[PDB]
Design a protein around this ligand. Structure first.
Ligand code: PFI
Length: 562
């Protein structure tokens, strides 16, 4: 069936859209080639519509059925509970999309009578009615990228499809416990969202070492959300239903599946009918869990079809990496084609065709790769990095323009040991926080799709707990990593190391001069910038820091605030 049908009504914005990085003294000090940085807008929604719209053909075989049976068996070991209206309300981001029924996210969080009553009525309706398609809004996302000259043309806007706030709270009540606990039970060590960046590195390295002649590949599905069929979504529901659930949960899950998850009408911000969806909704609670299960099922079966030897998968939504035993270069290329053919039959055709890789450092998954640097003792150590282009472009935008959610803070947290997060992101943003006297102000950021309020002054202990003390003393980064950063700095027009070091020393001195948590930031985050090093001992606050909850599950598109 067609992933989408369209009426001709436009996908409309509801606020002004800026497409060019503005000229701004603060962002200019970070990167001067502002014309390289753009944001997507509703103007390119038509381009995206064409890309996401196609007929899916799906044929299922014995391998598919076998894997599904195994997954259901694991799912049957899971007991999940309904959330109360209170608990669900508390998971709603403060700035989540308001309801069309006269209340917003703040009212939901405050347990406002108008909010809570409508939620109860939506829930009751889910129980009474298991057929009527539920309305969704479709919007073009405004996301920031750098121009890729070698590729041609800007990325068009991604779309988001989401039901009303009232429905989203009901999804949490029925399914929050399921989507938080089920994936790890079903997929075990293959479930990527259970890992911190360091734990992800550990899993990848150990998996690589477990093979005699390791070979790995990332598999890019062409528009994964759109490839997801009614069958796939019903199969996901059948997996959910294997859980030990309350009767009202079972009914609500069945209802949400029939009325929302399988498909439904698309409405623009002007209230006009834009068309109809028969694929994954990108803005529902089950997007991440559904994609992860479905990607895992199809890939596991395709591994068997391709007769890959000892395939180990790591899955995060639609992001898939496979590590296996090499059968030789020609044999590997042939087996990857068979894998691709199998995935295609399952309705997960390739974007870029998968390529066998024999160096672990060259495998990119979740937009990231393992690399090597040296710790204080000179020992080679593994850590997670990524190309810094998008992080830096977004940092520049977030410098020039105010936004609730700050990718830069998430990037510092997740990539704290990296050359670029330390040299550039920490230096740049602490200089701004110093200038603004806003070090004490908590900021919102995203980790694995969930939103968190984080105090920048807590960064030293957060980094220690997450990455260890070595994050503050890594040096001698790999030539490949240094070269990649070098290319980025040239492309974006970012100042060189000598400039960042100078800026960092000044930032550090000021932080130190202020005492308290500010001084701890100066000492630990910027020790790299000084000749006369300070001794970096374990921070007492880090030992009593429970960073569990951060890496339990993925919630991208799921409207989750922790
Ligand atoms: C990209 C290239 C043209 O320039 C650089 C080369 C190396 C580095 C790393 C410098 C280093 C890090 C420490 C954390 C931030 C800067 C690590 C290192 O090996 C020595 C050092 O003085 O600091 C940055 C650079 F910007």
């Amino acid at each position: 069936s067609m992933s989408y049908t369209w009426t001709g009504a436009l996908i409309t914005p509801c606020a002004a859209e800026e497409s060019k990085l503005p000229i701004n003294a603060l962002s200019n000090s970070l990167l001067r080639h502002h014309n390289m940085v753009y944001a997507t807008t509703s103007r390119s929604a038509g381009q995206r519509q064409k890309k996401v719209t196609f007929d899916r053909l799906q044929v299922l075989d014995d391998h598919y059925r076998d894997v599904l049976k195994e997954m259901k068996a694991k799912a049957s070991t899971v007991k999940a509970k309904l959330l109360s209206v209170e608990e669900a309300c508390k998971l709603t981001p403060p700035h989540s999309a308001k309801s069309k029924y006269g209340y917003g996210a703040k009212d939901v969080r405050n347990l406002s009578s108008r909010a809570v009553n409508h939620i109860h009525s939506v829930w009751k309706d889910l129980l009474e009615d298991t057929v009527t398609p539920i309305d969704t809004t479709i919007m073009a996302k405004n996301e920031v990228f750098c121009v890729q000259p070698e590729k041609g043309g800007r990325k068009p806007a991604r779309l988001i499809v989401f039901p009303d706030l009232g429905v989203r709270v009901c999804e949490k009540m029925a399914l929050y416990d399921v989507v938080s606990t089920l994936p790890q039970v079903v997929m075990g060590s293959s479930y990527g969202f259970q890992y911190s960046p360091g734990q992800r590195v550990e899993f990848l390295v150990n998996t690589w070492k477990s093979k005699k002649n390791p070979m790995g590949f990332s598999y890019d599905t062409r528009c994964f959300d759109s490839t997801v069929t009614e069958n796939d979504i019903r199969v996901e529901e059948s997996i959910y239903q294997c859980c030990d659930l309350a009767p009202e949960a079972r009914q609500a899950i069945k209802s949400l599946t029939e009325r929302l998850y399988i498909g439904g009408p698309l409405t623009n911000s002007k209230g006009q009918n834009c068309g109809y969806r028969r694929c994954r909704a990108s803005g529902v609670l089950t997007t991440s869990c559904g994609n992860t299960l479905t990607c895992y099922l199809k890939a596991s079966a395709a591994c068997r079809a391709a007769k890959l030897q000892d395939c180990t998968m790591l899955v995060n939504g639609d992001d898939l990496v496979v590590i296996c035993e090499s059968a030789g270069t020609q044999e590997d290329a042939a087996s990857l084609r068979v894998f691709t053919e199998a995935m295609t039959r399952y309705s997960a055709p390739p974007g870029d065709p998968p390529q066998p890789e024999y160096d672990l450092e060259l495998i990119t998954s979740c937009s990231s790769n393992v690399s090597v640097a040296h710790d204080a003792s000179g020992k080679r150590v593994y850590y997670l990095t990524r190309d810094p282009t998008t992080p830096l472009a977004r940092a520049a935008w977030e410098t020039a323009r105010h936004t609730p959610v700050n990718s830069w803070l998430g990037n510092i947290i997740m990539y704290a040991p990296t050359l670029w997060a330390r040299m550039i992101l920490m230096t740049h943003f602490f200089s701004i926080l110093l200038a603004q006297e806003q070090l004490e102000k908590a900021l919102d950021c995203q980790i694995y799709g969930a939103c968190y309020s984080i105090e920048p002054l807590d960064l030293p202990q957060i980094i220690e707990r997450l990455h260890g003390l070595s994050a503050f003393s890594l040096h001698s980064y790999s030539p490949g990593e240094i070269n990649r950063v070098a290319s980025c700095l040239r492309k974006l027009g970012v100042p060189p190391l000598r400039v960042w070091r100078h800026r960092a020393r000044s930032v550090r001195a000021r932080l130190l001069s202020q005492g308290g948590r500010a001084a701890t930031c100066g000492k630990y985050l910027f020790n790299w910038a000084v000749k006369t090093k300070l001794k970096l001992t374990p921070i007492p606050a880090a030992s009593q820091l429970d960073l569990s909850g951060w890496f339990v599950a993925g919630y991208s598109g799921g409207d989750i605030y922790h």
